[PDB]
Amino acid sequence: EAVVISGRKLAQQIKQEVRQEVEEWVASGNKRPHLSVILVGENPASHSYVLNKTRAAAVVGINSETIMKPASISEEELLNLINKLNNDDNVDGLLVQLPLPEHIDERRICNAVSPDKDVDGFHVINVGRMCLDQYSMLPATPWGVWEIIKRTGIPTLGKNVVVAGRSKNVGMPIAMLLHTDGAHERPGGDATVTISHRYTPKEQLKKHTILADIVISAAGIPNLITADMIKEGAAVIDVGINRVHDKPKLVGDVDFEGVRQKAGYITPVPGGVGPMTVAMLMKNTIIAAKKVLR
């Protein structure tokens, strides 16, 4: 059977690194990091994600506040709020929980967050920097996937990788990190990467996955990955977060039970990539506090 990778345990390790980095930072006489989270409306999953972020900050000695506004907020109010936070020298990291309501321009909001406080790395300049392999605030899911892979010691250079999904904050960034030059200012994994998405024909994915040492699935489709798609021994990183009902539940992209047999490594849902996303946000927040980048 396949080694089940523990997202909880790895996220725990990263959390400890950060807790140590924050303590030393404060001991050297610096201000304790502060993370601000703007939460809009009342999406249940959002609300729980923000609690996961606030707990993680508390456990690593980073101060936080979630500012909850109602769905009804005007895009311009939101911009004012962000502008306040951007200007408050006590806020090191600012993020805006997604999705926002249909009447708010996401991209406009994401670009209003100061790049220097952009711990989500979703600002156009951080996306640009990332895509040029420069130092940047990396988005947290991609960074988490990366860490799961490196921390587990799975090789990437020369290897073959498939990423199912091409969203701009998850799939595309994963594909960008995995294929790029280990030698660049922000190293990448030098893999051979294939990006697939909703217009891949079922057969085409299969012909690609079967060739792949690593299959990273970030499509949000239960059971998109079945055991015949993977080649024996391959690492399967399941980035899917699918709420199904039976008992409302959390399931992945992968058929966990089945692929378990075929794969050399696999990651569970829940307890897989999710905890890592949250942990990498803590890394990004101490980076922000330290003003490395600007």
Next chain:
Amino acid sequence: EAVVISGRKLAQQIKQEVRQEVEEWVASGNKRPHLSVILVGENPASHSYVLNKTRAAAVVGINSETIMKPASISEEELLNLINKLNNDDNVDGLLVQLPLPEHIDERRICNAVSPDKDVDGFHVINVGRMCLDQYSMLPATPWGVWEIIKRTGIPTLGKNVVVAGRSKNVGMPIAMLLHTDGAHERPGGDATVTISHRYTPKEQLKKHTILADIVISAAGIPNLITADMIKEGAAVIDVGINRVHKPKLVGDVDFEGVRQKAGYITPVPGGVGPMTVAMLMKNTIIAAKKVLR
């Protein structure tokens, strides 16, 4: 055997569109578009590329000037010139011929060029905008590859595409254009895209090329694509520009071999190169119209 696609011919076509578009702009009362090129040093390829660009501009009714600098120029001197041209309201497009000397930082120069004059689309905001599928000044070579494909009627949606090479102004944007959503602000290809590079093993490139409906090579490696790598009927686009031996110029494909198996193919010379220069003209009229301001 392969329909050879003349990039020379398609580029002349595109230049004809641009010429009409420029004629219309001027006849409407607007300032004639002006492109400035900065050229540093003496790379002979570079000099010829600037010649190509200045000729293309002349053909399409766009004003040009090359400002040649010795390789000895400093980074700071280069930024002053760029800062000057950014501020000259007469200059609609501005490009710095690449590559630059080692003591000058490419990224920093590329980001000094005003994003609205950046007809190479290499400023970080333009890269970012492109990578988010927003309207942007698209880089000329990838846009030209896109144009070869689209005007030749080669479908992309659902297809397999390999792009060999992952450079930031050629391979990576080609992969970005080809895989992204056809529905976004800046439409992409909705293809299934595999990116390979200097560390793809030969067996591994081949295992992927063979499934490919379109293969696009931007490696700078002669005979990297051979006919047994290619699936019969596939489109093969040769981005390579390789100086071999009188001093000769070849692509990354084994043209003679590959044309016997592929359904379309592009030659070097005469394929992607002229398209690159053509798309730069389209970017310049775009810049002059201040469409994306």
